[PDB]
From a paper:
The superantigenic properties of Staphylococcal enterotoxin-like X (SElX) have recently been established. We now reveal that SElX also possesses functional characteristics of the SSLs. Here we present functional and structural evidence that SElX is an ‘SSL-like’ SAg. It has specificity for sLacNac and interacts with myeloid cells in a sialylated glycan-dependent manner to inhibit host defences. Consequently, SElX targets both the adaptive immune system as a SAg and innate immune defences as an SSL.
The crystal structure of SEIX8 was determined in complex with sLeX. The C-terminal domain of SEIX8 (residues N61–I161) adopts the β-grasp fold typical of the classical SAgs and members of the SSL family. The first 21 residues and the last 3 residues of the mature protein were undefined in the crystal structure, lacking electron density. The first structured residue N22 defines the start of the α-helix that sits atop the rear of the β-grasp C-terminal domain. An extended loop, which is stabilized by extensive hydrogen bonds, links the bottom of this helix directly with the first β strand of the β-grasp domain. It completely replaces the typical OB-fold domain, revealing SElX to be a unique single-domain SAg. The binding site for sLeX is a V-shaped depression in the side of the β-grasp domain, which is formed by residues from a β-strand, the opposing helix (a 310-helix), and the irregular polypeptide loop that links them. Seven residues lining the sides of the depression hydrogen bond directly to sLeX. These are the side-chains of T130, E132, K135, Q138, N140, and R141, and the main chain carbonyl of K128. Indeed, the binding of sLeX is almost entirely conserved with the sLeX binding of SSL4, SSL5, and SSL11.
Author numbering: 22 to 165
The structure:
């Protein structure tokens, strides 16, 4: 099963709770309502995950330090938060984009069906520039 293997590759990459010395502490890469320090931001994931034509609206957010990070890092943490509601589980690949929206109207688009392209890994992003993350993801079939 090749579709299953492609799913497993995305799951194995993005389910890791560390990257480059950062880690998911206190569920900060999943969901928090805890008060923010002056040096933190909270980026809300606002979107839909539609499975076999039924829309789900999972509520997740990521709590990060204010700093310049790489797109590899932000892509990682964002997809980790998606995995926490069920993204990349089972045997079928999702499709659709996850979009990092910036405060002045910029975007970084993360295509969900494949890994981040290697040539994008080192793009530098100030976490304080991020407005939110939107997404419209589709999994065409349920697992049987
Ligand atoms: C085969 C392959 O992977 N080739 C990639 C390019 O990806 C292909 O071409 C794209 C135009 C698109 O059709 C894609 O589906 C193809 O796989 C890749 O180009 C980037 O691809 C991503 C999506 O995977 C985005 O479309 C990106 O555009 C944007 C973005 O939305 O992310 C536009 C945006 O305005 C811009 N924002 C800023 C602030 O600069 C961002 C940003 O530059 C990047 O996200 C930072 O990485 O890009 C396409 O540029 C291309 C560059 O990675 O490499 C191969 O050619």
């Amino acid at each position: 099963n090749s579709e299953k293997a492609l799913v497993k590759k995305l799951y194995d990459r993005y389910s890791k709770d560390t990257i480059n010395g950062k880690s998911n502490k206190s569920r900060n890469w999943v969901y928090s309502e805890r008060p923010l320090n002056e040096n933190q931001v909270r980026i809300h994931l606002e979107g839909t995950y539609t499975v076999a034509g039924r829309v789900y609206t999972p509520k997740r957010n990521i709590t990060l330090n204010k700093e310049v990070v790489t797109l590899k890092e932000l892509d990682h943490i964002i997809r980790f938060a998606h995995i926490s509601y069920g993204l990349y589980m089972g045997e079928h690949l999702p499709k659709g984009n996850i979009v990092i929206n910036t405060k002045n109207g910029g975007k970084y688009t993360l295509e969900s069906h494949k890994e981040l392209q290697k040539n994008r890994e080192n793009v530098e992003i100030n976490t304080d520039d991020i407005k939110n993350v939107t997404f419209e993801l589709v999994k065409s079939v349920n697992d049987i």
